[PDB]
Design an enzyme around this catalytic site. Structure first.
Site, PDB file in Angstrom:
ATOM      1  N   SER A 199       3.806  -5.266  10.951  1.00 46.02           N
ATOM      2  CA  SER A 199       3.646  -4.130  11.831  1.00 46.02           C
ATOM      3  C   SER A 199       2.269  -4.204  12.572  1.00 46.02           C
ATOM      4  O   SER A 199       2.044  -5.129  13.313  1.00 46.02           O
ATOM      5  CB  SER A 199       3.866  -2.814  11.032  1.00 46.02           C
ATOM      6  N   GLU A 326      13.931  -0.373  11.992  1.00 42.13           N
ATOM      7  CA  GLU A 326      12.521  -0.178  12.189  1.00 42.13           C
ATOM      8  C   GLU A 326      12.171   1.300  12.459  1.00 42.13           C
ATOM      9  O   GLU A 326      11.138   1.753  11.990  1.00 42.13           O
ATOM     10  CB  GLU A 326      12.005  -1.049  13.366  1.00 42.13           C
ATOM     11  N   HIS A 439      11.265  -0.076   7.865  1.00 40.23           N
ATOM     12  CA  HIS A 439      10.049  -0.635   8.279  1.00 40.23           C
ATOM     13  C   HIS A 439       9.296  -0.968   7.011  1.00 40.23           C
ATOM     14  O   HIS A 439       9.092  -0.121   6.176  1.00 40.23           O
ATOM     15  CB  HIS A 439       9.340   0.429   9.083  1.00 40.23           C
TER      16      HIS A 439
HETATM   17  C1  OMI Z   1       6.315   0.846   6.797  1.00 41.34           C
HETATM   18  N1  OMI Z   1       5.351   0.744   5.715  1.00 41.34           N
HETATM   19  C2  OMI Z   1       4.549  -0.421   6.046  1.00 41.34           C
HETATM   20  C3  OMI Z   1       3.399   0.112   6.479  1.00 41.34           C
HETATM   21  O1  OMI Z   1       2.456  -0.568   6.835  1.00 41.34           O
HETATM   22  C4  OMI Z   1       3.422   1.437   6.363  1.00 41.34           C
HETATM   23  C5  OMI Z   1       2.531   2.374   6.630  1.00 41.34           C
HETATM   24  C6  OMI Z   1       2.817   3.705   6.405  1.00 41.34           C
HETATM   25  C7  OMI Z   1       4.041   4.070   5.884  1.00 41.34           C
HETATM   26  C8  OMI Z   1       4.919   3.044   5.638  1.00 41.34           C
HETATM   27  C9  OMI Z   1       4.599   1.773   5.874  1.00 41.34           C
END
Ligand code: OMI
Ligand SMILES: *[C@@H]1O[C@H](CO)[C@@H](O[C@@H]2O[C@H](CO)[C@@H](O)[C@H](O)[C@H]2NC(C)=O)[C@H](O)[C@H]1NC(C)=O
Ligand SMILES: *[C@@H]1O[C@H](CO)[C@@H](O[C@@H]2O[C@H](CO)[C@@H](O)[C@H](O)[C@H]2NC(C)=O)[C@H](O)[C@H]1NC(C)=O
Ligand code: NAG
Ligand code: NAG
Ligand code: OMI
Lengths: 534, 534
Positions: A199, A326, A439
């Site tokens: 990301s 995503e 995501h």
């Molecule tokens: C999608 N994951 C991966 C990520 O970096 C993140 C940051 C905040 C909430 C969820 C997350």
């Protein structure tokens, strides 16, 4: 030299700790400092290199996490809390971590992990980012760096040297300098460094590919669900400035000069900045963050798109891809009608509201063009279709289609592109079904968590993880995820002409072409033509 | 009164001819005049009623066809030549034809056919428009009228009374007046007149529904592949004027005044006008005709759309529909890459060219929006997909989506709507396969040609024809195509809410909903919003 856990570096000696891993052991060097603490009058400044030290730097425990917004949207829930800081937060947070096979290799492939978190959050020390399984399984030296997030990493008053912007990317670069300069002593080969990230970490990776000052410090790159050109990953200098002034306005700062603003911001406790950070966004939006990289003319010498077009970037190999769903996280957190504990069937009114939040920069004609493109008009009140359709809008617009645009441009000048689509929903996901393949949920597969029996993945998820890890490591080592002459199914090169990619799941590899082209021609060519004309 | 073939009317006595039909016989009164000849100084003028005559008007043979462009694109080919005039052409062409069951009924359902032909061509006397099979099979009195086409029917210099525009619609109205006034003497019931027509005849029908001066002259209406709001069926007064001046310019006319232009046009032989008629179109286009109805403030008191919106129209029952491949003819004749004797697989360059011709009024953003909407981006070089996709563009934009817009508006105020989709390709079609179910090829089914053994239809095509004829006639008689209390499958009412329609083919009736809604939301709502904004 005395023992396996003692490494002498150019910054000084460092003492590691032996760590168990899957009925074996390796060495870990946790919390090595790579910059001076960016505290007091250095808040917002470009990092300084760490002054070498006398004696032995105890590197047996994880460092502090950088100061950041903490998600309390679901207290005690592991789904959200696995992403939050698990160490004390501090401005003194510029450290890195290294997992080294035992016995110590001499010159092995090195992978350097850059955490995601929207440039407002993230930690090198999370359970899902534990490098030991990958280091051990694939015999790579595994580094994870850190970098300032939020206003600390990205407040941008262009023209000032006290808060120039981009300092968090400069932190990553400095860690990459220090790896270049020292990883040989831990048995890593500095000529074979792969940067990888998810990301905002994926976008960061793309940013080091483009930026002249970063290119020489690594060999190749992996981008997971992130691209440098994402609509959320950068702002203009004028917009950076505006948000920094607005931030000062929320803290009753003197606004007469940059010096005045910056001095006022530097007096504030970290948490005072974090508490008002979301107030500076220019629109009611989701998937937008306040303090992100700025197209400054230095780190990025021209617009990202003109660099991509002219081939002004590092030419090497890249491996990159996306997850199927995503958008779901951002809808859950920010869009009306989505909740954690329902199916989140979405009325037409909540659909329209979601579209608005999802495409904040759009005039009404623009909104209509989106809505038409994603609405089934034979069944426009199906709450599931509306929910799923909005999930696709957020993901396509923010992650998939920017990435597909990056890929197509990069592949003209680069030296080999491998593209994936990860679409396996983990059997033990605590988040509800409607969110799909969320995501960030490939990360656990990349880091090998499914090999740990206690975490309760299935055997076919263990196998998928082993296969991903081995694609990732073989690519880091050779520039190709496929093992030369093996009998497995071959991940083909993505080429301008054929545009192939593979799915990544528990079923036998299937190759496809032209990933989401129909929607990405909409987002990459039509919609921006429509908004320019109106 | 003396015999079956002699009818005394308010205009005078008329002598018919007995005609054989499917091993039986009926009476035909062909070539009855309903207006004075619109010749010399009456060219372009609104028709005058026919002065009654002494003696017996011989009505045993078909009259002349109006002066018109003649299609010579495929000499001797029956596919195209079945549409051309089969009688001598003359300006003296305002006549009608009546087929009356034997023995003469007393007060039966009357159907009045208005020919299509783009308002530039058409004839009441064509083989496919022979009323005898329908009159005989379904026991209706079957009228077919005629009307001036081309500049003769539609040259429009608004404000002038010598060439006001719309005179060809006034011709149709006068024939409808004469039927109202006289059909009782042929055994028809003037209180139960259905007007029906195809393409420009379908649009004409819709036009008599909207126009205050026509509404009272008929009871109900059938529209086949045509709607009053079609983009090709009307022009503004300013555009009418422009084309009339351009026409005079092509004939070296004095252009100082309307009187000057009109006098010059009136001196010209018919064929001089016909030879330059296509030169006045403002764009390089297909499915656009030079002299069509004009929104004049008289025949149409306001814009068609404001009448449709306010319910300013005749409220009654209507039955209407479309064919599956309305566009193919116009592509064959006018678009590059389509030919009669190939499959007409279409390159991407010919696709783009076709789009331009198909949507002449569109800016580039508009063209892109069309192209996106109809291109499969996973297979953008499939020549068949491009061919078919352009076929859908022409049909959707010109016939189907205007009609669907008309239906949706009409149904709010009307008293019952029956919608069909005719998608049977006749087994003996001389045109190539790629053209599909071509514009105009339901007509032969409506007029019962498949019951004639020699014309070589299949038995299931005979049955389809009998069923269509009986839907058409039962609807004319009762306002509902379904026979009360029968056992057949029921053609449901189209309603605002459910929007049902049926397919019309040789297979068992199937009901569907929301005919081409996805594409018609594009053509009826999005694209016009896009072109207004830019
Ligand atoms: C999608 N994951 C991966 C990520 O970096 C993140 C940051 C905040 C909430 C969820 C997350
Ligand atoms: C990656 O780069 C190398 C060149 O630096 C490519 O290998 C060359 O390919 C060309 C054309 O096939 C040959 O003329 C050279 O002899 C090759 N050089 C070497 C050292 O092998 C390779 O094609 C590139 N790969 C991709 C995917 O573009
Ligand atoms: C067509 O019009 C007639 C009315 O002129 C409708 O029949 C009426 O329906 C209303 C409401 O159901 C009743 O109150 C009247 O008693 C009916 N009148 C007659 C004479 O039957 C009929 O509903 C209309 N049909 C459609 C499809 O709208
Ligand atoms: C280093 O400090 C840690 C506390 O975090 C302690 O547990 C460990 O024993 C120390 N190691 C040495 C030998 O200094
Ligand atoms: C009417 O004229 C036609 C010629 O078109 C002729 O064939 C027919 O015999 C005439 N009928 C009578 C009885 O006048
Ligand atoms: C579609 N049919 C029906 C029709 O009216 C017409 C005119 C010209 C060529 C073909 C035609």
């Amino acid at each position: 030299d005395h023992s396996e856990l003692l490494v002498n570096t150019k910054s000084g000696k460092v003492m590691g700790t032996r760590v168990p891993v899957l009925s074996s052991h390796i060495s870990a060097f946790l919390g090595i400092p790579f910059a001076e603490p960016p505290v007091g009058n250095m808040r917002f400044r470009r990092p300084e290199p760490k002054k070498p030290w006398s004696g032995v730097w105890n590197a047996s425990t994880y460092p502090n996490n950088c100061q950041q917004y903490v998600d309390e949207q679901f207290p005690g829930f592991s789904g959200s809390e696995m992403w939050n800081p698990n160490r004390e937060m501090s401005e003194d947070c510029l450290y890195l971590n290294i997992w080294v096979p035992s016995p110590r290799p001499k010159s092995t492939t090195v992978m350097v992990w850059i955490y995601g978190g929207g440039f407002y959050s993230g930690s090198s020390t999370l359970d899902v980012y534990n490098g030991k399984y990958l280091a051990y399984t694939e015999e790579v030296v595994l580094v994870s760096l850190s970098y300032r997030v939020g206003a600390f990493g990205f407040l941008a008053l262009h023209g000032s040297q006290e808060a120039p912007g981009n300092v968090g990317l400069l932190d990553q670069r400095m860690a990459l300098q220090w790896v270049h300069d020292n990883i040989q002593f831990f048995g890593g080969d500095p000529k074979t460094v792969t940067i990888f990230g998810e990301s905002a970490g994926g976008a960061s990776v793309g940013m080091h590919i483009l930026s002249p000052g970063s290119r020489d410090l690594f060999r190749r790159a992996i981008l997971q669900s992130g691209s440098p050109n994402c609509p959320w990953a950068s702002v203009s200098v004028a917009e950076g400035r505006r948000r920094a002034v607005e931030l000062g306005r929320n803290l009753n700062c003197n606004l007469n000069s940059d010096e005045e603003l910056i001095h006022c911001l530097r007096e504030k406790k970290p948490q005072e900045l974090i508490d008002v950070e979301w107030n500076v966004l220019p629109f009611d939006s989701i998937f937008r963050f306040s303090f992100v990289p700025v197209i400054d003319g230095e780190f990025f010498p021209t617009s990202l798109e003109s660099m991509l077009n002219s081939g002004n970037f590092k030419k090497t190999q890249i491996l990159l891809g996306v997850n199927k769903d995503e958008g779901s996280f951002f809808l859950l957190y920010g869009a009306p009608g989505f909740s954690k504990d329902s199916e989140s069937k979405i009325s037409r009114e909540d659909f329209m509201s979601g579209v608005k939040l999802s495409v904040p920069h759009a005039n009404d004609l623009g909104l209509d063009a989106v809505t038409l493109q994603y609405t089934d008009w034979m069944d426009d009140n199906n709450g599931i279709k509306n929910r799923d359709g909005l999930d696709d809008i957020v993901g396509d617009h923010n992650v998939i289609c920017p990435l597909m645009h990056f890929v197509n441009k990069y592949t003209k000048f680069g030296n080999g592109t491998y593209l994936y689509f990860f679409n396996h929903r983990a059997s033990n996901l605590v988040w509800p079904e409607w969110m799909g393949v969320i995501h960030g949920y490939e990360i656990e597969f990349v880091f090998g968590l499914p090999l740990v029996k206690e975490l309760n993945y299935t055997a076919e998820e263990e196998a998928l993880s082993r296969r991903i890890m081995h694609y990732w490591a073989t690519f880091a080592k050779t520039g190709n995820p496929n093992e030369p002459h093996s009998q497995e199914s071959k991940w083909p090169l993505f080429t301008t002409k054929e545009q192939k990619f593979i799915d990544l799941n528990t079923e036998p590899m299937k190759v496809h072409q032209r990933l989401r082209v129909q929607m990405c021609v909409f987002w990459n060519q039509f919609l921006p033509k429509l908004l320019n004309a109106t």
